[PDB]
């Protein structure tokens, strides 16, 4: 069942979401960029084909649904998402909200104006497509800027009006989740509607269990990110960090071992094009992780099983938690 989630191909039953990656991208870009300069990615056709191959690989590994958390300012192209979703037979949930690169036409807006924008994308549809967002993505990088405070409040308001969940980018090492939580709660948003993302970028379990104890979903969503072996590459070092995937994966077990199995969401933060960072970062990433969005089911899940995590628990994390999170509530 009955409960429904909006995808780029229309409504689906919550129970058909199945194994769901909750923080992913088809393409990390900027508003209007794919339209104005598709050759940056070879071509739009090349980008789409690459995404379809990647999604088919994830599907073969058991992934049924991804949540593409690309906002307006990540250059979300909902037609692209629909095309690749259809071709790969993988459900894609699209996002509204704002990441940390909003243009002036967004930065000048009030909380009321931002709320109306997020509601448009959830309730009416994105652009002129009728495709509705199933999640609201927001971001801080350290202490929230004044504008980011408005974005988080607008996200809370839009979530409260629609039941659609909120998911966040954090600077995990700066413990952004604490302020994000304070702002969301100041708007009366339930922690169960919120995922504090990039939380596997830190090993601070005091911070992570603090959030989980409050009922937040903890997004351990950068599983394959490691610059181990690439320390000479400064841009890769800065973005990927120096912790292994096994170290990140251990956080899943750490939270389960501390009673928080129902508070965990697991993902890759992968993409098939990436224009908002250094040129050729996509080639570096594809070398680090050729499995792409199949990495979680192929490497992380078996690692956890071998460490003694029961299959029912792993099913709970990868199927039940996303279903509960995405189901408008």
Ligand X SMILES: CCOP(=O)(OCC)Oc1ccc(OC)cc1
Q: Which residues are annotated as a binding site?
A: 23, 25, 137, 169, 198, 269
Question: How far apart (Å, rounded) are the C-alpha atoms in residues 215 and 325?
Answer: 12
Q: Which of 7, 167, 276, 321 binds ligand X (CB under 6 A)?
A: 276
| Smallest separation (angstroms) from ligand X to the CB of 320 | 24
State which residue, 73 or 83, has the beta carbon closest to ligand X.
73
Question: How far apart (Å, rounded) are the C-alpha atoms in residues 243 and 250?
Answer: 11
| Smallest separation (angstroms) from a copy of itself to the CB of 146 | 15
State which residue, 107 or 324, has the beta carbon closest to a copy of itself.
107
The interface partner of residue 239, options being ligand X, Co ion, a copy of itself, none and the CB cut-off 5 to 8 Å by kind, is ligand X
Within residues 136-155, the interface with a copy of itself by CB under 8 A covers: none
Give yes or no for residue 109 binding a copy of itself (CB under 8 A): yes
Question: How far apart (Å, rounded) are the C-alpha atoms in residues 220 and 130?
Answer: 31
Q: Which of 74, 84, 122, 326 binds ligand X (CB under 6 A)?
A: 74
Q: Which of 15, 43, 60, 110 binds a copy of itself (CB under 8 A)?
A: 110
**φ and ψ of 241, to 5 deg:** 75, 180
Strand bridging mode 10-13 / 20-24: unpaired
Residue pair 118/72 in contact by the 8 Å Cβ criterion: no
State which residue, 19 or 240, has the beta carbon closest to ligand X.
240
Annotated binding site for Zn(2+): 23, 25, 137, 169, 198, 269
**Can you spell out the DSSP letters for 123-175?**
II-STTS-PPPSEEEEE-SSSPPHHHHHHHHHHHHHHHHH---EEEE--GGGT
Neighbours of 236 (CB within 10 A): 22
Residues in contact with a copy of itself, total (CB under 8 A)? 34
| Smallest separation (angstroms) from Co ion to the CB of 21 | 11
Residue pair 157/187 in contact by the 8 Å Cβ criterion: yes
Q: Which of 15, 43, 60, 108 binds a copy of itself (CB under 8 A)?
A: 108
Residue pair 27/77 in contact by the 8 Å Cβ criterion: yes
**Can you spell out the DSSP letters for 93-121?**
E-EEE--S---HHHHT--HHHHHHHHHII
Which residue stretch of 150-158, 214-222, 249-257, 270-278 sits at the interface with a copy of itself (rule: CB under 8 A)?
270-278
Q: Which of 24, 68, 73, 201 binds a copy of itself (CB under 8 A)?
A: 73
Q: In terms of Cα–Cα distance, which of 125, 186, 126, 195 is closest to 157?
A: 186
C-alpha R_g of the chain: 18
The interface partner of residue 308, options being ligand X, a copy of itself, Co ion, none and the CB cut-off 5 to 8 Å by kind, is none
Within residues 108-167, the interface with ligand X by CB under 6 A covers: none
Within residues 18-47, the interface with a copy of itself by CB under 8 A covers: 29-33, 35-37, 39-40
Q: Which residues of 36-54 are buried (b: 16+ CB within 10 A; e: fewer)?
A: eebeebeebeebbebbbeb
Chain positions contacting ligand X, by CB under 6 A:
25, 28, 70, 74, 99, 104, 169, 239, 269, 276-277
């Amino acid at each position: 069942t009955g409960d429904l989630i909006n995808t780029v191909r229309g409504p689906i039953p919550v129970s058909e979401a199945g194994f769901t990656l909750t923080h992913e991208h088809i393409c990390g870009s900027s508003a209007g960029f794919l339209r104005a300069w598709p050759e940056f990615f070879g071509s739009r056709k090349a980008l789409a084909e690459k995404a379809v191959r990647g999604l088919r690989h994830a599907r073969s590994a058991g992934v049924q649904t991804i949540v593409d958390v690309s906002t307006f300012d990540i250059g979300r192209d909902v037609r692209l998402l629909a095309e690749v979703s259809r071709a790969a037979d993988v459900h894609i949930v699209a996002a509204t909200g704002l990441w940390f690169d909003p243009p002036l036409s967004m930065r000048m807006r009030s909380v009321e104006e931002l709320t109306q924008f997020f509601l448009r994308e959830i309730q009416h549809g994105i652009e002129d497509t009728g495709i509705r967002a199933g999640i609201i993505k927001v971001a801080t990088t350290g202490k929230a800027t004044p504008f980011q405070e408005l974005v988080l409040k607008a996200a809370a308001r839009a979530s409260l009006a629609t039941g659609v969940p909120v998911t966040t980018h954090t600077s995990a090492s700066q413990r952004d989740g604490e302020q994000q939580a304070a702002i969301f709660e100041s708007e009366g948003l339930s922690p169960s509607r919120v995922c504090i993302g990039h939380s596997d970028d830190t090993d601070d379990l005091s911070y992570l269990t603090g959030l989980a104890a409050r009922g937040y979903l903890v997004g351990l969503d950068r599983m394959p990110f490691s610059a181990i072996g690439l320390e000479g590459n400064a841009s890769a070092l800065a973005l990927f960090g120096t912790r292994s995937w096994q170290t990140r994966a251990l956080l899943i077990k750490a939270l389960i071992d501390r009673g928080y199995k129902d508070r965990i969401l697991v993902s890759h933060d992968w993409l098939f094009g990436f224009s908002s960072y250094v040129t050729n970062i996509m080639d570096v990433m594809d070398r680090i992780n050729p499995d792409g969005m199949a990495f979680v089911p192929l490497r992380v899940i078996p690692f956890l099983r071998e460490k003694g995590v029961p299959p029912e628990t792993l099913a709970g994390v990868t199927v039940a938690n996303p279903a509960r999170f995405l189901s408008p509530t």
